[PDB]
Amino acid sequence: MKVRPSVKPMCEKCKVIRRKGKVMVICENPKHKQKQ
Amino acid sequence: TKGILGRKVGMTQVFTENGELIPVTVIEAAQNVVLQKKTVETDGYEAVQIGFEDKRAILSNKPEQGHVAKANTTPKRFIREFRDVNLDEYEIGAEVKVDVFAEGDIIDATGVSKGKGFQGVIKRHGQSRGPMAHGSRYHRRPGSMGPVAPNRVFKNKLLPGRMGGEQITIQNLEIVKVDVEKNVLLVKGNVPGAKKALVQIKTATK
Amino acid sequence: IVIPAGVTVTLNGSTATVKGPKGELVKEFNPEITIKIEGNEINVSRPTDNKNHRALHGTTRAILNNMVVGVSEGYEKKLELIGVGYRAQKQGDKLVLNVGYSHPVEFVAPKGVDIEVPANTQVIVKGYNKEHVGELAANIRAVRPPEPYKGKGIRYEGEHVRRKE
Amino acid sequence: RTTYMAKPGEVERKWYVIDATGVSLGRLSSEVASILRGKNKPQFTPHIDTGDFVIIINAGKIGLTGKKATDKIYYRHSQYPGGLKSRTAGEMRTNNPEKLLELSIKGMLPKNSLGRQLFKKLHVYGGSEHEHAAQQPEVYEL
RNA sequence: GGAUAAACGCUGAAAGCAUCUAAGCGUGAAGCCCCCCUCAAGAUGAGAUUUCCCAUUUCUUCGGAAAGUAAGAUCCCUGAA
RNA sequence: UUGGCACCUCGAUGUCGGCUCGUCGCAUCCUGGGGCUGUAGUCGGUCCCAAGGGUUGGGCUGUUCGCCCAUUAAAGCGGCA
Numbered sequence A: 001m002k003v004r005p006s007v008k009p010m011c012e013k014c015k016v017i018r019r020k021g022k023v024m025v026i027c028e029n030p031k032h033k034q035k036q
Numbered sequence B: 001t002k003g004i005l006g007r008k009v010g011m012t013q014v015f016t017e018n019g020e021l022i023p024v025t026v027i028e029a030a031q032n033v034v035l036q037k038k039t040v041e042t043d044g045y046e047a048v049q050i051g052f053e054d055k056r057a058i059l060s061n062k063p064e065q066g067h068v069a070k071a072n073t074t075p076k077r078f079i080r081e082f083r084d085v086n087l088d089e090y091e092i093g094a095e096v097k098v099d100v101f102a103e104g105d106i107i108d109a110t111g112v113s114k115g116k117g118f119q120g121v122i123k124r125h126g127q128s129r130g131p132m133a134h135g136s137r138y139h140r141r142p143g144s145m146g147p148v149a150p151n152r153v154f155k156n157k158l159l160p161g162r163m164g165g166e167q168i169t170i171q172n173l174e175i176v177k178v179d180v181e182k183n184v185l186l187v188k189g190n191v192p193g194a195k196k197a198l199v200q201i202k203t204a205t206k
Numbered sequence C: 001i002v003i004p005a006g007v008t009v010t011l012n013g014s015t016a017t018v019k020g021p022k023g024e025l026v027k028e029f030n031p032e033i034t035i036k037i038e039g040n041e042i043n044v045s046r047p048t049d050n051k052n053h054r055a056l057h058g059t060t061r062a063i064l065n066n067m068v069v070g071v072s073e074g075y076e077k078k079l080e081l082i083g084v085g086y087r088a089q090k091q092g093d094k095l096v097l098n099v100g101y102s103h104p105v106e107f108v109a110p111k112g113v114d115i116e117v118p119a120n121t122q123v124i125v126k127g128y129n130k131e132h133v134g135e136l137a138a139n140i141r142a143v144r145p146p147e148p149y150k151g152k153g154i155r156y157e158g159e160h161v162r163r164k165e
Numbered sequence D: 001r002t003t004y005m006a007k008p009g010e011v012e013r014k015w016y017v018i019d020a021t022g023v024s025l026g027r028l029s030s031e032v033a034s035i036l037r038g039k040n041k042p043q044f045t046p047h048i049d050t051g052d053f054v055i056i057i058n059a060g061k062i063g064l065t066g067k068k069a070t071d072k073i074y075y076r077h078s079q080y081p082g083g084l085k086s087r088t089a090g091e092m093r094t095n096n097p098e099k100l101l102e103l104s105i106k107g108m109l110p111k112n113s114l115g116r117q118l119f120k121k122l123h124v125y126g127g128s129e130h131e132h133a134a135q136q137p138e139v140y141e142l
Numbered sequence E: 001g002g003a004u005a006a007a008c009g010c011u012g013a014a015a016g017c018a019u020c021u022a023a024g025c026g027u028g029a030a031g032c033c034c035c036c037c038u039c040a041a042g043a044u045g046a047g048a049u050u051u052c053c054c055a056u057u058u059c060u061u062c063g064g065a066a067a068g069u070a071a072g073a074u075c076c077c078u079g080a081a
Numbered sequence F: 001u002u003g004g005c006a007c008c009u010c011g012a013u014g015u016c017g018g019c020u021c022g023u024c025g026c027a028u029c030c031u032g033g034g035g036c037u038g039u040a041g042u043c044g045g046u047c048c049c050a051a052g053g054g055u056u057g058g059g060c061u062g063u064u065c066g067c068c069c070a071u072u073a074a075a076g077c078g079g080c081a
């Protein structure tokens, strides 16, 4: 995980979602896991 | 779970079959009797009320006499409840000998520690003496109460006072020997309290 | 929205039951939804078309359908073991795994779930409750999930393990 | 000159029962406080307890809107350093709801000798049953 | 042990897929509540159980009082664990 | 922290360092849990949750700091005149 205010897609496979009131992105790439 | 009350007779040491040497406290646990059997419906908690020593009817009184007569025995000096214990055992009036235990059986010993009087902090609470030279005029005093900002000193700042008399349980002691004739129980190591003190021995919670 | 042979759907307010050849499934749904019944088919609707009701419409439909497909055909999930020494067995109705730890790990399949050992490198979960099937498969996989550098561990058979140098 | 001031014992004082099921903690407590202080009566006199005695049942079913079950936090302090102990409103509703409504209503009563005396007139039960049938009490509706 | 954090997930839509969440389920920390030790009913919310003493006499128009006792406890005395 | 302001105190609010006693925060040093890894394993880097407990003894200096010797699981940063 990378915890950042700047949660944005890093590729085209990244997918923004809203889990527990927080913006995450999930991708197949584990690096792209972003939390806000 | 199983328990008795006893008096501390003293300390000695015993050789085991290995030739190892084992200090032991001696507990004399005569005249133990069951006096009342408390229930969840009568009281709210299950327990067994044991009385330990026989005493004289002029040191007793008519209330205690009645309570023991409901058990069909004499007035008693020490009376104590034990919990976490089965009540299908322990019929009223029954005598409760040391033979309930066994060698190597494992216990908690609960008693009232010895009386040191008014003591200071380094003995009581283990604090450190300040230097005794190099100009010190601070040897056995307690230290700073605290900082300035509260305008007060916090609770549990530890200070002189009356040291002992506190109740203490020692855990996971081992029973070495049982002698039903002498009404004697041997315990590896120690227990709290002076000689002639009451000890409450019971099967260990863990 | 099929209701195949043998299935019986019953309702009482927010509660519901579905019986069938393979088990009973008593569950609940929130009452705000609306039901309509045919002998082979049961439909669902939402009164107001606001956020929660949209969320719950397809949810409730899918969950009913899962209940139905479970009682009528059940569910299977396949886990394969990858790695020398990684061994599976069942002592009757108790799975046991021997996967390179200094001990084995055992599992019990709760009421409605069942295990199967078609081989030492292969185990399968079976049930009529999809939730329990997936959960027990997930927990069984959780013991040695796949490492990338070789793939050594449990995995679903159609899982796309990522590997590295 | 001349306007009525009550006297202790001058006023009949009744015993009321409330089903706390589904009502919000604060709304129920606000109605109960006024009953206890005696503002439903025109015999009200600020320095005298004209109010009634009150019973609350099914307190474990008291309503808590929002995430208050997890996020409304009750605090106690032992006056020892770090003697702060927290507990959630939902947990209290489950285990010790009597103390919950007690806490709510205490902060809504006056902070005096009288208000302390008024708190004693409250008898709370998380169940449907109470001990005070001997007083044969009436239902109150909010 | 019970419930959680971060985290991992099951099922599952909103949004014919996908998604650990939105409804709902599970795992999950030396931490939280308990387990263990101690104090604790002045806990004026003053709790409970067991046993004991009994319903005296003067008065006072009432309230209420005092004046000897019971169960029991002490002044006093020998003392220490 | 360096500073700026000069608002209480000049009919007195005692200073550095140390000793005694600690207590609090978390921006966690160790122990504990976890995600990413340019994570093979051992070791590690970075980041999230965690403040429960623990966090050395000496040589030089008045010294804080700092250098050094030797250990440690670790030898935390800071607030409380």
Ligand SMILES: [K+]
Residues within 6 Å of the ligand: F010, F012
């Ligand atoms: K000055």
Ligand SMILES: [Mg+2]
Residues within 6 Å of the ligand: B128
């Ligand atoms: Mg020293």
Ligand SMILES: [Mg+2]
Residues within 6 Å of the ligand: B132, B136, B137
């Ligand atoms: Mg001196």
Ligand SMILES: [Mg+2]
Residues within 6 Å of the ligand: none
């Ligand atoms: Mg758990």
Ligand SMILES: [Mg+2]
Residues within 6 Å of the ligand: none
């Ligand atoms: Mg002055």
Ligand SMILES: [Mg+2]
Residues within 6 Å of the ligand: none
């Ligand atoms: Mg001065």
Ligand SMILES: [Mg+2]
Residues within 6 Å of the ligand: none
């Ligand atoms: Mg942090």
Ligand SMILES: [Mg+2]
Residues within 6 Å of the ligand: F061
């Ligand atoms: Mg020097």
Ligand SMILES: [Mg+2]
Residues within 6 Å of the ligand: none
């Ligand atoms: Mg030096």
Ligand SMILES: [Zn+2]
Residues within 6 Å of the ligand: A010, A011, A012, A013, A014, A015, A026, A027, A028, A029, A032
């Ligand atoms: Zn991506």
